[PDB]
From a paper:
Viable crystals were first obtained for a complex containing the type I inhibitor indirubin E804. The structure of this complex was solved using CDK5 as a phasing model and refined at a resolution of 2.4 Å with one CDK16 monomer in the asymmetric unit. The complex with indirubin E804 displays some disorder in the kinase N-lobe, consistent with its requirement for a cyclin partner. However, in the indirubin E804 complex, the αC is reduced to a single helical turn and the preceding PCTAIRE motif instead adopts a loosely extended conformation that is stabilised by crystal packing. In particular, the partial unfolding of the αC helix in the indirubin E804 co-structure suggests that the isolated CDK16 kinase domain may be relatively unstable in the absence of a cyclin partner. The indirubin E804 scaffold is largely planar and binds to the kinase hinge region of CDK16 using three hydrogen bonds, including two from the indole-2-one moiety and one from the indole moiety. These groups also present a significant hydrophobic surface for van der Waals interactions with the ATP pocket residues Leu171, Val179, Ala192, Val224, Phe240, Leu293 and Ala303. The hydroxybutyloxime moiety extends across the expected ribose- and phosphate-binding sites of the ATP pocket. Here, the flipped-out conformation of Phe305 in the activation segment establishes a cage-like structure around the inhibitor. The binding therefore features an induced fit that maximises the kinase–inhibitor interaction.
Residue numbers in the entry: 162 to 198, 205 to 311, 324 to 473
Write the structure that this text describes.
Amino acid sequence: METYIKLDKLGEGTYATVYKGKSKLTDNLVALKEIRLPCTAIREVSLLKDLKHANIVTLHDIIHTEKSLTLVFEYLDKDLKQYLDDCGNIINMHNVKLFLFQLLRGLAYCHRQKVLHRDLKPQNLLINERGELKLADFGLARAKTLWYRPPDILLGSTDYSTQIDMWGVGCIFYEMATGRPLFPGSTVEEQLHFIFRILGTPTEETWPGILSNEEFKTYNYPKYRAEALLSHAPRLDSDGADLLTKLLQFEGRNRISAEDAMKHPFFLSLGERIHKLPDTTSIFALKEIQLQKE
Ligand SMILES: O=C1Nc2ccccc2/C1=C1/Nc2ccccc2/C1=N\OCC[C@@H](O)CO
């Protein structure tokens, strides 16, 4: 803390606290991730890797104090929840699509790099004035809030894979398209009920093995019939609802990949030039791609 000026608190966690910062040299704003610590083993994914992608926050410096380790990142002034709330929870549809493509890029890179999001949610997704969406370095973990949790995990799943993150993508896509959470459950039991009311109660046909699950049988769920997603999110189009469907699959193994999610017809309007961009270049670089005023 000799070259930076620590400003207001942006957020907190059990493992770290984040502060808005400024350089005394360049005057540029930064994010100071204060890692909360005789000896402390540091496992930071931003330190044990180099997640160099246009949709992941970029690490700039490391500071050692006798009491802490501060990771200096690039700064974004609003998180997805703050952005939603600022435009009264009504995001321009073209932007929802740009935000979604961006989120799928960052995640498809993490997955490629064997990185998982243990807690994907709007507050961990950040947005700048150019319309860029990036994954904050918070809750990222090597492969070794109940709202965004998949049904299989809730019903006892030993598989902690990239597929978990895909259910969260579906949840956030809906939250962006409608301005409200898809399944805001308070208990494991209520969350499952909230899910089955939208997707339908699983049958041996839609989810093989369910009736053999001890915890599922004990909850006595009414046989709910699936409600058309397009009816729940009218601002969405046929392709938007189809991508949502393919994302919100009961079983992780059937959930579309982040790579394939990007090749879906919902994104056709964006063009072929966005698929050829290297990891490090912004999607906005293209004349064809631009943020719409809210
Ligand atoms: O710009 C930023 N670069 C980062 C690098 C790592 C962690 C956070 C941030 C960050 C943040 N920029 C902003 C802007 C508005 C609100 C929060 C916020 C940020 N981090 O807060 C995330 C905390 C997490 O616990 C979710 O609440």
